[PDB]
Amino acid sequence: DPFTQNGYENPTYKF
Amino acid sequence: PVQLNLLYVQARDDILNGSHPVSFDKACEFAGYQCQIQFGPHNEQKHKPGFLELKDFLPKEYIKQKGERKIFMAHKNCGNMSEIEAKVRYVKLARSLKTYGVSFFLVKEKMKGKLVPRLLGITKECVMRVDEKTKEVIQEWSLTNIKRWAASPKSFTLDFGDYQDGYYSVQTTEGEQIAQLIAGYIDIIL
């Protein structure tokens, strides 16, 4: 729900 | 590096299968990176002409183009770049493109003279016409510019109201699919 517009995602997740 | 690998694979697949249309010049930049990622640094003693199975490094429309010379140049140009560096670069290149994150359909338009193919792309923010060969973005309409839309089994149509004169009409069998996508992006705003 809160990730519908300014949903920036992290390319280092579980790197 | 799980998520970076997930990203790179998504972006590489979408490019390699035409989901993400890229100009030929970009196809070889991407391939150049892919060569680095899969074979390491370029080594003339090991990467001989004819060795590259182009079906695995280029979208199909471009295999006919004999671009192995171009690919090995971009592969050379990567120097001693690490595998992970090449992946970050691959993803950044894809995302730097207007076409990134855009669902496309291949449709035929009419012109002032025979029906020409054209890539019609939809996102949440707009609707674009894109050149089927060069992939240059030739017209961009904001979604709030669309008065109404309609889909036949053998056509799709846009009415832009006061923003363009004359309807935009298009030969496609996926017309109900293009419009389904658009309606869903409308629904979220309200």
Author numbering:
A (entry chain A): -4 to -1, 754 to 764
B (entry chain B): 209 to 321, 324 to 400
What is written in the article reporting this PDB entry?
APP comprises a large extracellular region, a single transmembrane helix and a short cytoplasmic tail containing an NPxY motif (normally referred to as the YENPTY motif). Talins are synaptic scaffold proteins that connect the cytoskeletal machinery to the plasma membrane via binding NPxY motifs in the cytoplasmic tail of integrins. The central adapter that connects integrins to the actin cytoskeleton is the protein talin, which contains 13 helical bundles that behave as force-dependent binary switch domains. Here, we report the crystal structure of an APP/talin1 complex identifying a new way to couple the cytoskeletal machinery to synaptic sites through APP.
Using the design strategy of the β3 (739–749)-talin (209–400) chimera, we generated an APP (754–764)-talin (209–400) chimera, hereafter called the APP-talin chimera. The APP-talin chimera crystals were birefringent flat plates belonging to space group P212121, which diffracted to 2.7 Å. The crystals belong to the space group P212121 with a single copy of the APP-talin1 (F2F3) chimera in the asymmetric unit (AU). In contrast to the β3-integrin-talin chimera, which adopted a homodimeric arrangement in the asymmetric unit mediated by reciprocal F3-NPxY interactions of the two fusion proteins, the APP-talin chimera showed a ‘daisy chain’ style arrangement where each APP tail interacted with the F3 domain of a symmetry-related molecule. The NPTY was well resolved in the density and closer inspection confirmed that the NPxY motif of the APP was binding canonically in the NPxY motif binding site on talin F3. The mainchain density for the APP (754–764) is well defined and the side chains for N759–F764 (including the NPxY motif) could be unambiguously placed. The final model comprises residues 209–400 of talin1 (F2F3), with residues K322 and N323 missing from the loop in F3 that connects β1 and β2. The chemical shift changes upon addition of APP peptide in the NMR data precisely map onto the APP-interacting surface on F3. In this assay, the APP and APP (4A) peptides are fluorescently tagged by covalently coupling a fluorescein-maleimide to a non-native terminal cysteine and titrated with both talin1 and talin2 F2F3 domains. This confirmed that (i) both talin isoforms bind to APP and (ii) the interaction is specific but weak as expected since talin also binds weakly to the NPxY motif of the β-integrin cytoplasmic tail in solution (with Kd in the range of 100–1000 µM).
